[PDB]
Amino acid sequence: ANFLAMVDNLQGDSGRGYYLEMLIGTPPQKLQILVDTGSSNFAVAGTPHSYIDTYFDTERSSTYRSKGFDVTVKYTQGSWTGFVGEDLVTIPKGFNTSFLVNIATIFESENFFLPGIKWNGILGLAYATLAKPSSSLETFFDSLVTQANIPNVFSMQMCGAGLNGGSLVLGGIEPSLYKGDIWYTPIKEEWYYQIEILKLEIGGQSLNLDCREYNADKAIVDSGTTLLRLPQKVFDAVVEAVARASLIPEFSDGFWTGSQLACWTNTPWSYFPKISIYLRDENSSRSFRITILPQLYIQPMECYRFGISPSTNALVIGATVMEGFYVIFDRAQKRVGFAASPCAEIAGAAVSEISGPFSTEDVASNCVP
Amino acid sequence: QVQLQESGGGLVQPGGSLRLSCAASGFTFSSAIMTWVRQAPGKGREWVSTIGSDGSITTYADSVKGRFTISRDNARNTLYLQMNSLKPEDTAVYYCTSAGRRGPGTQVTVSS
Ligand SMILES: CN1C(N)=N[C@](C)(c2cc(NC(=O)c3ccc(F)cn3)ccc2F)CS1(=O)=O
Ligand SMILES: [Cl-]
Ligand code: NA
Ligand code: NA
């Protein structure tokens, strides 16, 4: 593997996703694949659909083999059913050889191929235990780690910078994508990339919630989620704190729910507070904080939408937070790394910060229930 | 729960041969991609060969092409590696892996 050749291997943005070019079958068919750290299947369109240009035609691949079974995957607000097979895949921006992997080819779906997408499948990079129909279906990254002789690590940089593609470095860390220190937080549970959130701070003030409220369902790092998603009680506390700290006198209730845009003539970002998320260090007595500036949560659409949404379920660190950071998914060492992204800059200003260490003596030793 | 157990290694001279086996249980072997990897002390992990579930698609590292042959018997839940024309630099623990799990491996030593 060549990590320098992986720089700028993603196209897209937080609106419609970050996607990787993949070549599938013999002769190769080129697909555009969403990079998804919140799922564990490699699944591609196998039939024509309204919101896609191309699909993988298994009949045109001489190396494709059918496993003889289907899989149905269901999400909140969507689903698909596909045939499960095996074929050879190359990733041209990083590798020089092909690898044998499992592939699901989608023949029916609901709410999956959304309006506006440039991708026609998904690359699930989470752990085997989320794979469907079961964890015996070898995941793409498990196949790649073995067959390509790479370390069990990948890293991601998203350069949309709250509006320039990105990089998926399969097998390691590219030094040219960050400056300063990488801070590591333990993976609490290897399914999603579940990490432990200790504290949220808005404009320098703590929310003063029990730290279990940040982890109750789970806190995860998910490149296939657009917004920062917060459990309802955390969301309401954040909204209250943003409205108190902001130099805008009035926000509508509809602004916070995404029903109304906030509009100005000639930049709103100086009128909003920084938002900080504190993560436990590998030493449990230390934490570090990842900080997003208003640029990452007051999103241009000049009119602006709120870049945070309430969750029925989990606390999700999605693409818009990830647009601030080089994120290292260190599966081998059971940890997630963060460094501030040099590309996370708008109008000459960094849109994110990282700092530490801070003491965890005032917080419980386990914030997951 | 998944079990992989390799056997068939040994100590051979240069130009010798071995037949490695891996017995599998606790999953549907007939639907599993299977891979052989090798690891020698002080060296990097080295992919050897992969075989698709029906046995028809096989791939090999350049370092072993034309010398080693991967195969499987789905009815017997067994993976094989036929190793010919063995060289000192093939010395390693050889292990089978599938879906992020691995067996403990079998030692291959090639020496005069
Ligand atoms: C949150 N989810 C996730 N991680 N993966 C899935 C496969 C998914 C992701 C997308 N993601 C996206 O479309 C998307 C768009 C812009 C971004 F910045 C990031 N992701 C679309 C469909 C879909 F099924 C299921 S989901 O439950 O919806
Ligand atoms: Cl498999
Ligand atoms: Na083809
Ligand atoms: Na497998």
Side-chain angles (χ1 to χ4, degrees), chain A residues 1-15 17-29 31-49 52-59 61-73 75-76 78-109 111-113 115-117 119-178 180-207 209-243 245-249 251-265 267-301 303-311 313-361 363-369, chain B residues 1-42 44-64 66-112:
Chain A
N2 180 343
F3 304 151
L4 260 180
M6 304 167 192
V7 173
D8 305 321
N9 71 354
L10 307 179
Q11 289 179 100
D13 49 43
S14 68
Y18 288 88
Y19 56 92
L20 180 71
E21 280 180 41
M22 306 182 75
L23 271 48
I24 312 172
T26 306
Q29 292 174 58
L31 276 79
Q32 289 77 49
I33 304 294
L34 181 73
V35 174
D36 186 12
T37 67
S39 70
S40 299
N41 280 77
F42 180 34
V44 307
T47 66
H49 193 89
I52 71 183
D53 300 329
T54 60
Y55 59 100
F56 177 47
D57 187 352
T58 59
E59 298 190 353
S61 179
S62 62
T63 48
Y64 177 82
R65 301 289 182 268
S66 173
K67 293 201 190 262
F69 62 85
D70 301 348
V71 62
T72 296
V73 174
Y75 317 118
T76 310
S79 62
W80 55 266
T81 297
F83 306 117
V84 190
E86 302 167 10
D87 211 340
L88 296 170
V89 169
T90 55
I91 295 165
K93 291 174 166 70
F95 300 85
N96 65 328
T97 195
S98 60
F99 313 102
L100 185 65
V101 304
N102 295 306
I103 184 159
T105 50
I106 297 168
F107 60 86
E108 58 177 67
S109 58
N111 289 11
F112 184 70
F113 297 121
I117 70 172
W119 50 266
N120 38 55
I122 299 188
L123 175 60
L125 295 175
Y127 294 90
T129 190
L130 304 179
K132 296 294 185 181
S134 77
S135 71
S136 62
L137 190 73
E138 180 172 291
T139 70
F140 185 95
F141 194 66
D142 286 314
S143 295
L144 186 64
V145 163
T146 312
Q147 294 172 51
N149 300 318
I150 59 167
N152 185 25
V153 179
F154 65 88
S155 56
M156 282 188 55
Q157 179 163 85
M158 291 178 178
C159 294
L163 301 186
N164 297 273
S167 302
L168 176 69
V169 181
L170 295 161
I173 299 170
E174 173 44 49
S176 70
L177 306 182
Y178 71 104
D181 305 319
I182 299 162
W183 289 88
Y184 289 103
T185 194
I187 294 171
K188 292 288 287 179
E189 187 62 41
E190 296 158 301
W191 56 327
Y192 303 100
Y193 294 94
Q194 180 174 359
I195 62 175
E196 192 185 3
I197 293 171
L198 306 188
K199 186 178 181 192
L200 266 62
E201 197 172 74
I202 306 297
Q205 208 181 299
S206 181
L207 302 182
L209 290 171
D210 190 282
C211 67
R212 290 171 293 179
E213 300 290 349
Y214 307 126
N215 301 278
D217 188 274
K218 56 200 170 272
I220 65 169
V221 181
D222 181 12
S223 70
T225 285
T226 54
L227 304 184
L228 175 60
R229 303 193 84 243
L230 304 175
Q232 191 68 61
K233 187 163 150 63
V234 181
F235 183 78
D236 296 342
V238 169
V239 163
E240 180 173 29
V242 172
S246 290
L247 301 176
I248 299 301
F251 294 95
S252 71
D253 296 345
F255 182 65
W256 309 116
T257 60
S259 304
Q260 211 178 47
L261 302 174
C263 306
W264 289 269
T265 185
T267 172
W269 297 313
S270 62
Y271 306 109
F272 282 94
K274 294 174 190 183
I275 302 183
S276 286
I277 301 170
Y278 291 73
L279 299 175
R280 201 184 295 281
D281 190 70
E282 293 189 272
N283 175 336
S284 62
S285 76
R286 304 197 316 162
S287 65
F288 60 98
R289 84 184 166 204
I290 57 169
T291 299
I292 60 169
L293 273 63
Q295 283 86 334
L296 294 181
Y297 76 85
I298 300 301
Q299 318 197 321
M301 298 296 297
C303 295
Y304 299 84
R305 203 178 301 278
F306 195 50
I308 314 186
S309 64
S311 184
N313 37 303
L315 199 159
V316 192
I317 300 172
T320 61
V321 175
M322 292 184 67
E323 274 177 1
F325 306 91
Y326 188 34
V327 184
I328 297 89
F329 295 83
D330 189 354
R331 295 154 58 96
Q333 304 187 63
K334 199 174 176 186
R335 63 191 188 166
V336 179
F338 294 84
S341 289
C343 71
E345 285 191 343
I346 290 165
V351 309
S352 58
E353 300 162 9
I354 194 169
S355 65
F358 305 95
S359 169
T360 66
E361 72 196 314
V363 173
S365 75
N366 187 21
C367 295
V368 181
Chain B
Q1 187 251 15
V2 176
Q3 299 280 316
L4 299 163
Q5 179 61 61
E6 303 85 348
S7 56
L11 169 65
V12 303
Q13 302 176 58
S17 56
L18 294 165
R19 195 202 189 190
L20 310 190
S21 294
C22 188
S25 74
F27 61 104
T28 308
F29 181 84
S30 65
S31 81
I33 298 167
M34 284 285 141
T35 298
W36 287 103
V37 183
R38 70 186 181 186
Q39 173 70 67
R45 170 173 43 85
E46 193 178 10
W47 176 65
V48 177
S49 178
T50 293
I51 185 162
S53 58
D54 81 4
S56 65
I57 302 297
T58 57
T59 60
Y60 295 94
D62 287 346
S63 52
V64 308
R67 302 193 298 123
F68 301 179
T69 305
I70 197 169
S71 65
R72 66 197 294 156
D73 184 341
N74 283 351
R76 289 192 187 283
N77 270 218
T78 308
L79 176 70
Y80 301 105
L81 188 69
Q82 179 63 47
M83 305 176 86
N84 299 325
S85 302
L86 281 163
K87 303 173 184 177
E89 55 262 44
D90 300 313
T91 299
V93 177
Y94 285 70
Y95 62 94
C96 167
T97 184
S98 185
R101 289 81 147 187
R102 56 159 291 185
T106 189
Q107 180 70 50
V108 170
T109 306
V110 187
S111 178
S112 301

